[PDB]
Amino acid sequence: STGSATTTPIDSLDDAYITPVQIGTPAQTLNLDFDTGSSDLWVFSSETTASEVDGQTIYTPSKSTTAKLLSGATWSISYGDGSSSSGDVYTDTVSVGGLTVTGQAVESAKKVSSSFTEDSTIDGLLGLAFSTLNTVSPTQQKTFFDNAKASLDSPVFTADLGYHAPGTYNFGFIDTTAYTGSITYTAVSTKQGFWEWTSTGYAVGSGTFKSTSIDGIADTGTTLLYLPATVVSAYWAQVSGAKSSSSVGGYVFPCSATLPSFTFGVGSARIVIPGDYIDFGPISTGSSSCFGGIQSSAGIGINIFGDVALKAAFVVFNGATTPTLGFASK
Numbered sequence: 001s002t003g004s005a006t007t008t009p010i011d012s013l014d015d016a017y018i019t020p021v022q023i024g025t026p027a028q029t030l031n032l033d034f035d036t037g038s039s040d041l042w043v044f045s046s047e048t049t050a051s052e053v054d055g056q057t058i059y060t061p062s063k064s065t066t067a068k069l070l071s072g073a074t075w076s077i078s079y080g081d082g083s084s085s086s087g088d089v090y091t092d093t094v095s096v097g098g099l100t101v102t103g104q105a106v107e108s109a110k111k112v113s114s115s116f117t118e119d120s121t122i123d124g125l126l127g128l129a130f131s132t133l134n135t136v137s138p139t140q141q142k143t144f145f146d147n148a149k150a151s152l153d154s155p156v157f158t159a160d161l162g163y164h165a166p167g168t169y170n171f172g173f174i175d176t177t178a179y180t181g182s183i184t185y186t187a188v189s190t191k192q193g194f195w196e197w198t199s200t201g202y203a204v205g206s207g208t209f210k211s212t213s214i215d216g217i218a219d220t221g222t223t224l225l226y227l228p229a230t231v232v233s234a235y236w237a238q239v240s241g242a243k244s245s246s247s248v249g250g251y252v253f254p255c256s257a258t259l260p261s262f263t264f265g266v267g268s269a270r271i272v273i274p275g276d277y278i279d280f281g282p283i284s285t286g287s288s289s290c291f292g293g294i295q296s297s298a299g300i301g302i303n304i305f306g307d308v309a310l311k312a313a314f315v316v317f318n319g320a321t322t323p324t325l326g327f328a329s330k
């Protein structure tokens with residue numbers, strides 16, 4: 001089997017991408033944030049604290065003839081950014097772009113943090129990291145991809161995120177028309193439960209490539225590109241007037257600037273992030289200071305190849321017995 005679904009930016013800055021997902025019988029369609037940095041499929045629901053719902057579409061398990069309470073199961077997730085959610089668990093039928101999994105754990109939120117409440121366009125998250133990170137207790141549950149994997153034509157999914165435009169998540173096949181040149185594959189460590197890999201280096205604009213190992217995670221659920229402070233300083237030093245602002249929370253730059261590109265290495269291959277992808281617009285309405293799309297990972301504890309990086313590539317998440325990651329230009 002295969003599935004193919006369009007993913008759409010939630011706003012004019014590509015702050016996140018939402019993908020329609022059918023849950024239950026009859027289908028209830030919710031727009032979920034596909035997150036390769038976590039392993040829980042959770043949704044706003046009829047059980048979510050009323051004051052914590054602000055415009056989201058909710059899953060109502062009582063209206064699904066295929067929903068079953070997973071007796072005694074609870075979940076609770078604390079994301080590294082300080083966001084969180086928790087609740088109980090149903091199993092139900094879940095379909096993405098024509099690919100159907102029966103008995104999928106659907107984690108119904110009773111509580112969500114303010115960040116989620118404020119994101120009216122995101123009805124929940126669909127985790128695509130390794131199932132070892134799933135938070136359901138006392139019986140850990142499998143991700144949608146893990147449940148689908150054996151049935152798929154090939155045990156893979158691909159992320160093709162658009163810049164200021166829709167893109168595509170495919171399951172079970174590689175669309176050879178969706179990228180240019182070749183796909184370069186690189187090793188993955190699953191030791192921390194993430195799609196963790198090692199970039200071979202970077203360049204800023206037309207500058208020379210610096211060969212250096214950068215270990216990080218491919219995370220479709222993170223907006224920005226978080227890299228070591230040395231790398232990030234080297235990038236922003238090429239932008240007149242750019243500076244790190246403790247008050248804003250990262251590097252900002254004059255909105256009048258033209259940003260240089262940023263290149264990252266994948267083996268001997270190179271992915272170029274155009275400068276425009278690194279512009280996140282005014283820090284507040286009407287400001288001439290703009291927020292940067294490349295930020296320091298210092299204090300996160302891991303480097304994160306978020307959407308700013310991933311949207312410059314066609315990315316293969318290969319879930320074979322020994323997982324790997326593939327990157328192509330597009």
Ligand SMILES: Cc1cc(C)c(/C=N/NC(=O)[C@@H](N)Cc2c[nH]c3ccccc23)c(C)c1
Nearest residue numbers: 033035037038079080081083219221222300
């Ligand atoms: C200090 C710091 C700052 C950030 C922005 C992250 C990213 N975290 N990103 C994620 O955890 C995503 N995989 C999922 C996610 C967290 N918060 C969200 C809000 C809206 C949509 C998705 C997420 C971290 C780990 C640490």
Ligand SMILES: Cc1cc(C)c(/C=N/NC(=O)[C@@H](N)Cc2c[nH]c3ccccc23)c(C)c1
Nearest residue numbers: 013015223248249250280281282283284291
């Ligand atoms: C993931 C994340 C990380 C940071 C450092 C901020 C702070 N932002 N501070 C501000 O003053 C923002 N209004 C700046 C901003 C403008 N556009 C954005 C798009 C994404 C993230 C932040 C901003 C936020 C909101 C989210």
